[PDB]
Symmetry: C7
Subunit: 107 residues, 7 copies
C-alpha cells in the first residue's frame, strides 16, 4: 500500500473503498440534490498514513472507518503529483482529514 505520500501534523490520509452506498440510485432521476445532503453521505476508507501529531494509539494503518464526504478532502494521487500519470488513469482515491473528524474504526 505504501506509495510516496505521508500525512503530516494532526492529519490522516486514507484511501477510499471501491464500493460505497451509491449503488442504490433508488432516488427519482432529475432531482436536484443539495450540498448538505451530499456532504452527509458516508465514505468508507482505509487508513493509509497517520500524521506524527495524531495522538499515539489513535488508529493504525489498514484500519477501516467511515467519514462524511463533507469532512474529507481529496488529495492528488502521488503519481499525478509526481507527474507520471494522468488523473483519469488513476483508480485509487486518496483523501485526508483531521484526526478529530474520525469517530470510529470497524476494528
Amino acid at each position: 500500500q505504501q506509495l510516496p505520500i505521508r500525512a503530516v501534523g494532526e492529519y490522516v490520509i486514507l484511501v477510499s473503498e471501491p464500493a460505497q452506498a451509491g449503488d442504490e440510485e433508488v432516488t427519482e432521476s432529475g432531482l436536484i440534490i443539495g450540498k448538505r445532503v451530499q456532504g452527509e453521505v458516508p465514505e468508507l476508507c482505509v487508513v493509509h498514513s497517520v500524521g506524527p501529531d495524531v495522538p499515539e494509539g489513535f488508529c493504525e494503518v489498514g484500519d477501516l472507518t467511515s467519514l462524511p464526504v463533507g469532512q474529507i478532502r481529496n488529495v492528488p494521487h502521488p503519481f499525478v503529483a509526481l507527474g507520471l500519470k494522468q488523473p483519469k488513469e488513476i483508480k485509487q482515491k486518496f483523501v485526508t482529514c483531521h484526526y478529530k473528524a474520525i469517530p470510529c474504526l470497524y476494528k
Copy 2:
C-alpha cells in the same frame, strides 16, 4: 450486544431504540417541516462504545440516553461496512456523537 465497531477519540457510538417520537404523525398531512424542527426531535439511544478519550466515568455501555437528531450522525452498520449486507436489510441503527453532546443518562 457488541459488533466489530469501536468509538475512537472523544466520540461515543450508540444504537438507536426501536420506538421513538415518530408515532404521533397525527399532525396535519402535507405540511412542510423545517430542518431546525427535525433536528430538535430527540432520539433514544443506548451506549454501545465509548471512545478512549472520553473522560473516565462519563458513561457506560448499555446506558440509555437521549440526543437531538441534529447532534448525532448515522454510522454505516459494520455489516454493510464489512461488505456483507445491504443497508436495507439492516434494522439496528448505529449513530455517533461527541461526548460533550450528551447531557443525561436514564439511570
Copy 3:
C-alpha cells in the same frame, strides 16, 4: 423528587415549574411571534440533577432558577424513555442546559 435520570458532564437537568409568565395572554390575537422573541421568554425551573463536571458548589438540587427558553433543551421524561408512560400522560417537563448558561439562583 429524584427519578431515574441523571445529568452527565457539565450539564444540569432541571424541572420546569407549573406556572410561567405565559398567563400574559393579553397579546393581540393572530400575531406572528418571531423565534428570537420566543427564545427570550424565561423559564422558571428547579435543579433536579447536576452533572459531575459542573464545578463543585455551583448550585444544589432543589434550587430554583430562570433560563431563557432558547438556552434549554427539552429532555424526554424518564417514563417515556423507559417505555412505561405515553408522552401525553406526562405532566412534568424535564429540561437540560449547560451550567454556564445559568446566571442566578433564587436562594
Copy 4:
C-alpha cells in the same frame, strides 16, 4: 436591598435605575427602530450581586455601571419567581450579564 436572589458563576446581577435614556423622546414618531440600534441603548444599573467566579476585586455591590441593552438579560423578580407577587405590580427590574461585558464603574 438584598432579596433571595444571588448570581452564580461568572455572572453579575444588577438592578436597573428608575431614569434612563427613555426621556429624550424627541425622535420623529412613526419611525421603525432596528434591533441593533435598540441594543445599543445604554442601561444604568447598580450591582446587586456578584457571582462567586467573578474575579475578586472586580466590582462591589452598590456600584453603578452602564450596559448596552443588548448585553444584558432581564431576570424575573424574586417575588414573581417565588410566586408571591405578580409582574405588573413589580417596580424593580433585575438584569444579568457576564462580568466580561462590564467595561466601567461610576466610582
Copy 5:
C-alpha cells in the same frame, strides 16, 4: 481629566478628541453611507482610565491613540449617569474598548 468613572477588567476608557476626520465634508451630499464604511472611520482619543486587568505597561493615561468607530462603544458621561445633567449639555465624549483593540499610541 479624572472624573468619577473607572475602567474595569481588560477594558480601557478613552475620551474623544474635539476635531476628527469628519471636518473633510467635501463628499457628494445625499449619498447613503454603509455601516462598514462608517465603522472604519478612525476616532482620535485620549486614554482616561485603564482597567486593572490590562497588562502592566500597556499604555498610560493621557496617551493619544486612534480607534475605528466600530471598535469602540460610547459610555454615558458620569454626570448623566450620576443624574445631574441631561446629555445635551455634555461636551466630553467617553468611549470604551477592550485593550486588545488598541494597536498604537502617538508618543
Copy 6:
C-alpha cells in the same frame, strides 16, 4: 524614519511603499470590483514599529513585507493626529495589523 507613533501589544505598524502593482490599470474601465477582490490585493510595506508583545525575533524595523489590503488597517499619520497637518498634505501612509497576519519578510 521613526515618527512619534509606536505599536502596542501584539500589533505592528508598517509604512506603505510608494509603488504597488496598481501600475497595471489595463483592467477594462467601468467594471464593478467586489470587496473580496479588493481585499486580496497585496500591499508592500516596511516595518516601522513592533509592539512589545510581538514575540522576540519575529521581525525588525526596516523589514519589507507584503500584506493583503484586507488584513491591514490605515492609521492616521502622527502629524494629523498631533493636529500639525491636514490629511491631504500627507504622503506617507501608515497601516497596522496583528503580527500573526504577517507571513513573510523580503530579507
Copy 7:
C-alpha cells in the same frame, strides 16, 4: 533554490509547480464556475521556506505537497517586491499558508 524571501511565524512559503490540474480543458465552455469549486482545486507546491514557529520536524525545504487554491495566498515575487523586475516577466509563483493547512508531503 533560495532568493531573499523568508517565512515568519507559523507560516510556510511554497513555490507553485509549472504543471497543474488546469490541463483538462474538457470543461464545457461558457459555464460560470463558483468560488467554492475554484477554491477546491489543488495546487502542487514545493516548500521553499518554513517559518521559525512551525514545529520542528514538520516538513523540509524541497518537499512537495498539495494545497487547495483557497487555502493559500499569492505572495509578490521578491524581485517585484525589491522593485527589480516586472510581475509579467516573472515565472516563479510564490504562495504562502499557515502550516496547519498542510495535510501531506509527497515523500
